[PDB]
Ligand binder design. Structure first.
Ligand SMILES: NC(=O)c1ccc[n+]([C@@H]2O[C@H](COP(=O)([O-])OP(=O)(O)OC[C@H]3O[C@@H](n4cnc5c(N)ncnc54)[C@H](O)[C@@H]3O)[C@@H](O)[C@H]2O)c1
Ligand SMILES: NC(=O)c1ccc[n+]([C@@H]2O[C@H](COP(=O)([O-])OP(=O)(O)OC[C@H]3O[C@@H](n4cnc5c(N)ncnc54)[C@H](O)[C@@H]3O)[C@@H](O)[C@H]2O)c1
Ligand SMILES: NC(=O)c1ccc[n+]([C@@H]2O[C@H](COP(=O)([O-])OP(=O)(O)OC[C@H]3O[C@@H](n4cnc5c(N)ncnc54)[C@H](O)[C@@H]3O)[C@@H](O)[C@H]2O)c1
Ligand SMILES: NC(=O)c1ccc[n+]([C@@H]2O[C@H](COP(=O)([O-])OP(=O)(O)OC[C@H]3O[C@@H](n4cnc5c(N)ncnc54)[C@H](O)[C@@H]3O)[C@@H](O)[C@H]2O)c1
Lengths: 318, 307, 307, 318
């Protein structure tokens, strides 16, 4: 933006977007943080509340804005989206969120913005592909949160089972982010040893690992049943991806990336290990999944593909 | 708690307590964080949500508990409550089982009205004054720092300024003891065309900020979640850091036998010592007037409590 | 330099420059760090040693380079040297190729004597005053903070105190503008049985600390490696933080056309503004006397190399 | 030590011990740091220099002490040693350092100290075993730096080769810490993909990987040739292990641990993945080495054990 001064624009100030902003304030990442949402007064109240964290953390210019403020932004994070109502279908979550997204991306690009998009709005793989499509940006400049949140929940759960720090569990959730997703246990390790071997060694059966994987898959549902909403894990994950970009780290993170052959997939965004740096996605790393895990991945992707395309077809049914 | 392992118990899992817990997770302060509230499902759900921050911050054992879990805690932070009477009532239901668990660390009190409830936590717990610390004017001092920082294009952390008085409407900016780069804020203000009226409006903004945030988005919690993390850090990393907290007056400012906001040095054993800001005669009058209603309300609530 | 990628060039890889680089690696500040010095085999070896810190701190591209690597650097830190005439000579060999590389970021000057070499870096580079910052009295102000902190059982970061004057023997503790928790250090001292004589001895300790560390272990570098990392942080994270630095006097303290230590606001464009500490009449006399000598030696050295 | 106040005693204030203390000061780990060395005025001058870092980092009580200051310490870090001279034999390096060590450990234990030992003095696996033996402490309360420095140099090297952050390279140097040591490539990964596959994929041959491993093995030697001494990497590694202990992390780190069957080894300390926490070593994790790599490891260990017992035998020859 101006010398030694990085600028992030948040589009979508709900609990996700807001706990992301607070995590970015606790971490001292970026020097200017713009909050954009249709509920303008909300964004003015949250900027005032957030900016009070500065006396004890690090200075940051936080304020309520508009899409034109994206002009010289380095990163635009899209968390804006509607929740799935009771009785509502999955394709209708897609439908309304594609609509909301198409209202966001065009003015963001028309502001002159040419930094990176980070997309976290659900369903995230569909909406990341659609952000790429609507913006016309290079694939590497559009990154989705993919399976970063669920991979963290798998790390927390394996960490808890095996009395290890979650950051020392090298494990990924693969597939499209919900119910068809699975723990990629075949490529998962703790201290370079396979999680299944650590498991067997310690009396943890493959059934126990299956229940653990189920816990991870149901965790969003359980947190929403207990307290109404879930946002701390993805606010943190979005801060970690923003950090890899803004501190040019070339760090390996679970993100959503454009498939160009990897895993036998094409023209979809889906969750992968990938190297993230200051220009965006540097490269995709294909986790060497077992034959069973790769079938799961391709199945999950096949149906994601179908829903991505119905959604987009309906968006052009004018 | 167990070797090289610090334990914090949060009593009160509303938006203040919860954003405090999140700030503690982003900062890697303490190794075990227990969430206690009456509404158990909420705390169970928040521990699960909070613990997912660990894969990208630092490991922490976060879970939903009960008052008995305070037994070997180092710090109990009370953010619970809904007014003086209903909050004294809620507080008396919290402190007695926390002390009966065998807890003997430090209380950090942030439930409103904070000065009254901090003194009542001291009175109900029977702890030493230095082991009961209130948030006092830490939040509004931060808001003053942010506002002066914005006015003068300075980092809020370089604004040495305090809000004094009892935490609401009778409170004031102690401008006579406030500085930026050791220069008095009123002189910086003059030098830059900012009048004493402008400083009075700025002080008004600070005093009204909670009200304005609640009008715009319904609730205000990020500033005090952060302030509570900063005081917790000074305690758990034994820093002897100078912070705005609520402390027991023993003669300072001409006050006795109330908790109120002061500069104080905070460390591993709790409050190390109070530092009396050398207020102008006008500012000291405001402080003593503000303090004078406090003593009446506090004592009305404590006597009410026992009938 | 390239997207979301800051670049620092260190000129001078002795113990100061090297411990600065290590502090920048522990802190994760800047993404690329180039080490430039006359002895290339030392800079090569230090880049290899330093880069091993990355597996457990944060990634950084550290390598040995030349002045041409300053082309697109954001910050050039000059710690190189060997008195006034030999260091002015070494400096003039550094600045001209650094500027000819096309560099137009900020200079941070720590080479001794620092106030004289900071002014000469401004003069030889032709840069704006705000883009040439010296370390001024930042190290000795830190030593005063550590000593008052130790005397009064306070965290050094909560001691608001500056060493003023030209950085050695004529320098003094600006006690009249120094505070802990907004209370004057002399009042805290008097309240605690610390006499003005005791404060004078404390100030002597700070003034002699470099000499004493060199007598005990041969060299002193950790304090200035840290202070240089803090000023670099305020620049690269655009903080507008108030720090002790060396800045161009333009009337402040009754001084003109010398660089000397002041409180100042530091941000992403360099020095944002000088803050004149409101010194007592005695302290201002000391400052002006000290400055008067600096100013002679400066213009003598500069006239000598113009021959 | 006293409430919410951790205490570390450093024995050995040369360049390693001193850059460790500086790294601990920049990181705000521990509240009290005692510097002990036979050269007392050096520990006094370094405490003064070090404590000046506090105004801009975090408060720490740093001072020069004696072995009796270990009484209530949580951690004692032994970096004290004499360097190998030209013409001197490997067993004579072991010999003088065993002598120095026996002069350190007994007064440290007699002070009443019962925290954890972290041993970094060279040769580190031999001296870590001897610290265990001389102190009489549980194996889990005596931790050596093992291959942590060289594993970091391998991570930095693979990171540089593959344009990845070193912290995202899951790779270990195994064997006894010098010349017989090797890159455990078979259990090494980047984004869960095997380093050899990433290598093959990107045109980096097994020969190239062998040269890379040679660079790592020779890096200490090269740094000493260029600038006279090498200390920043092990000062940081020692701070990272101290952090895992003092912040009870159960983090997986390269350390030196007592072999009780692992890798087919017994009654030696050697480099392993292990989980480190507030009570010391929580558990050893056996990297599933290829048969070739395990042969290398066992040969390296066989010869370390030989030198170990030669040195301890000469220390008993009175
Ligand atoms: N990617 C992941 O893994 C992950 C996980 C959980 C949640 N999230 C997602 O983040 C998104 C937001 O969640 P939240 O907690 O912030 O929800 P929320 O319902 O509390 O807030 C959503 C925000 O979207 C805004 N919005 C809706 N329509 C708008 C429009 N047309 N233009 C601009 N803004 C508009 C609302 O005004 C609101 O502030 C969801 O789609 C959610 O499922 C991501
Ligand atoms: N000190 C300050 O400067 C500052 C500033 C703003 C808010 N806060 C205060 O902190 C407190 C909480 O604020 P909030 O916005 O999170 O409100 P809140 O009412 O949503 O949350 C507090 C929680 O305490 C719980 N609680 C009530 N009785 C309890 C009991 N007996 N035991 C355990 N838990 C119980 C409730 O279930 C409630 O949700 C309030 O009193 C508020 O005014 C402090
Ligand atoms: N400003 C302060 O408050 C402060 C305090 C202490 C030390 N320092 C100063 O920083 C400087 C370095 O101190 P040190 O302890 O590292 O001592 P040192 O003598 O080892 O370092 C000076 C460095 O400058 C190098 N050098 C000389 N000519 C050079 C050239 N033309 N190009 C590049 N490099 C060149 C030397 O080789 C050496 O590495 C000194 O002048 C010292 O007094 C600053
Ligand atoms: N573990 C690793 O991977 C690794 C890597 C590099 C260096 N190091 C090691 O750290 C140690 C020190 O390295 P350095 O560069 O700091 O060395 P140095 O030679 O600069 O200093 C060694 C210190 O040991 C002290 N010492 C010697 N005899 C003593 C005694 N009897 N009691 C107490 N102290 C005494 C000396 O006085 C000296 O200050 C060495 O053994 C070195 O091999 C470890």
């Amino acid at each position: 933006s101006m010398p030694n001064h990085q600028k992030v624009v948040l589009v979508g100030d709900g609990a996700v977007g807001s706990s992301y902003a607070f995590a970015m304030a606790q971490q001292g990442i970026a020097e200017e943080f713009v909050i954009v949402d249709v509920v303008k007064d909300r964004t003015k109240g949250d900027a005032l509340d957030l900016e009070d964290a500065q006396a004890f953390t690090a200075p940051k210019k936080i304020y309520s804005g508009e899409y034109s403020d994206c002009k010289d932004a380095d990163l635009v994070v899209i968390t804006a989206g509607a929740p799935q109502k009771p009785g509502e279908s999955r394709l209708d979550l897609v439908n309304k969120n594609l609509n909301i997204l198409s209202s966001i991306v065009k003015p963001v690009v028309d502001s002159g913005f040419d930094g990176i998009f980070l997309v976290a709005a659900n369903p995230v793989d569909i909406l990341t592909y659609a952000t790429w499509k609507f913006s016309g940006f290079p694939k590497e400049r559009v990154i989705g949160s993919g399976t970063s949140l669920d991979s963290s929940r798998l790390r927390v759960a394996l960490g808890k089972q095996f009395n290890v720090d979650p950051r020392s569990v090298d494990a990924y959730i693969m597939g499209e982010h919900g119910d068809s997703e699975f723990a990629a246990y075949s490529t998962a390790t703790i201290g370079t040893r396979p999680v299944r071997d650590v498991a067997k060694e310690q009396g943890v059966s493959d059934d126990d690992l299956a229940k653990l994987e189920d816990g991870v898959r149901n965790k969003a549902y359980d947190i929403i049943n207990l307290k109404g909403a879930t946002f701390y894990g993805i606010g943190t994950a979005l801060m970690r991806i923003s950090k890899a970009i803004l501190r040019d780290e070339n760090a390996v993170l679970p993100v959503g990336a454009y498939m160009d052959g990897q895993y036998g997939l094409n023209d979809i965004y889906i969750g992968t290990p990938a190297i993230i740096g200051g220009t965006g996605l540097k490269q995709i790393i294909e986790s060497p999944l077992s034959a069973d895990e790769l079938k799961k991945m391709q199945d999950s992707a096949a149906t994601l593909k179908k829903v991505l395309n119905d959604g987009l077809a309906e968006l052009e049914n004018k």
